[PDB]
Amino acid sequence: MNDKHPTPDPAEDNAFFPSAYSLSQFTASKSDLSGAHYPTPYQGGRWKILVVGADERYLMMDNGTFFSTGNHPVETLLPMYHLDKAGFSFDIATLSGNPVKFEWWAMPREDQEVNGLYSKYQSSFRQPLKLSDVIETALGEDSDYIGVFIPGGHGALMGLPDSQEVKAVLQWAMKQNKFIISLCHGPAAFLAVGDDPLFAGYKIVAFPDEMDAQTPSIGYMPGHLTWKFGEQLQAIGFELLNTGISGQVFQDRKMLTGDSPLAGNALGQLAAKALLAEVEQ
């Protein structure tokens, strides 16, 4: 209950969920979903959003342990919930085709709306598309995709940040003037652009590296990250706006970001406002 020892995951060897103590501080039985009310949504039936989820749950720490992670389900479903109320569909993909892996220990078991949205979309989360297939068939200059969404959670740190596929999706989104939507550890995906000065000068919010440095001290993670996405992102031209976390978001042109597992509702609101304005015109 106050125990700060990481909790062992029985599915995998030397792999740990967050500690009981850290769970009682960073997770909650209900989300803060609110304001998802759009008196005139989009009813064209055309525009939908492409979600790029994490396909791995086990992230390797600097001490040889696995952190039992993945996408954060609040960060994932709160923005989708707003966009859904706004009249948009989603297609879900992972790099491998393998099912999207969420931090279930973070899922609010008492939030009816959040669990509602998920039962609606579980089949796509559980049998996602394969990003290569989406890229080959569903992009180009007249896509039905109005933008790409990259949820956070430490699962976003695996595969995505050096994937040549994400690179294609980001390059596509930029050249077709499309919305890019991310929060927390999700912006690590942006590093997939490699040496491309594509995002130079862009301003975002993201989980602060120094908080990642500190959270193991209570057993949130069974070790430390082997690298720092914050410093890399700055190294490719991004300007990180936030020293701490507060649920904050920011819009730089069509780039929409949130700072932490607190920013889900706000990112939903932001994206809904922005995309509704895009399509009503």
Q: What one-character DSSP code corresponds to residue 182? A: E
- Ranges of H-type helices in the chain: 20-26, 73-85, 112-126, 131-137, 164-175, 209-212, 229-235, 264-279
Say if strands 66-68 and 239-240 run parallel, antiparallel, or are unpaired.
unpaired
Experimental technique: X-ray
Domain boundaries along the sequence of the chain: 1-281
Q: What one-character DSSP code corresponds to residue 194? A: T
Contact 37, 85 (CB under 8 A): yes
What are the beta bridge partners of residue 181? 149, 256
**How many whole angstroms separate alpha carbon 174 and alpha carbon 63?**
38
Q: What is the number of residues in the chain?
A: 281
What are the beta bridge partners of residue 92? 51
* Residue type for position 101: K
DSSP-assigned letters across all residues of 219-267: TSSSS--SS-HHHHHHHTT-EE--SS-SS-EEEETTEEEE-STT-HHHH
Residue 54: active-site member: no
What are the beta bridge partners of residue 113? none
Say if strands 249-252 and 255-258 run parallel, antiparallel, or are unpaired.
antiparallel
Q: Which two tokens stand for residue 152?
A: 């956070």
**How many whole angstroms separate alpha carbon 160 and alpha carbon 166?**
6
**How many whole angstroms separate alpha carbon 142 and alpha carbon 82?**
25
Say if strands 129-130 and 58-60 run parallel, antiparallel, or are unpaired.
unpaired
Q: What one-character DSSP code corresponds to residue 185? A: T
The angstrom resolution of this structure is: 2.5
* Residue type for position 107: M
39-46 contacts at long range (C-beta below 8 A, 24 or more positions apart): 40/280, 41/85, 41/86, 41/87, 41/276, 42/86, 42/87, 42/88, 42/275, 42/276, 42/279, 42/280, 43/87, 44/87, 44/279, 46/144
Q: Is 45 helix (H, G, I), strand (E, B) or coil?
A: coil
Say if strands 129-130 and 89-94 run parallel, antiparallel, or are unpaired.
parallel
Comparing CA positions, the residue from 28, 3, 6 lying closest to residue 18 is 6
CA distances for 237 relative to 82, 112, 157, 231, angstroms: 30, 41, 19, 10
The catalytically annotated residue of 59, 184, 188, 204 is 184
- 62-208-103 Cα angle (round to 5): 65
- 80-253-139 Cα angle (round to 5): 60
Q: Is 68 helix (H, G, I), strand (E, B) or coil?
A: strand
**How many whole angstroms separate alpha carbon 272 and alpha carbon 37?**
10
**How many whole angstroms separate alpha carbon 170 and alpha carbon 147?**
10
- The alpha carbon of 230 is separated from its chain's Cα centroid by a whole number of angstroms, namely 15
CA distances for 122 relative to 30, 128, 154, 192, 268, angstroms: 19, 10, 20, 27, 19
CATH classification of 1-281 is 1.10.472.50, yes or no? no
CA distances for 245 relative to 206, 208, 258, 263, angstroms: 9, 8, 9, 9
**How many whole angstroms separate alpha carbon 166 and alpha carbon 158?**
12
Q: Is the dihedral of CA 125, 128, 131, 135 positive or negative?
A: negative
Q: What one-character DSSP code corresponds to residue 71? A: B
Comparing CA positions, the residue from 227, 228, 233 lying closest to residue 255 is 233
**How many whole angstroms separate alpha carbon 239 and alpha carbon 220?**
27
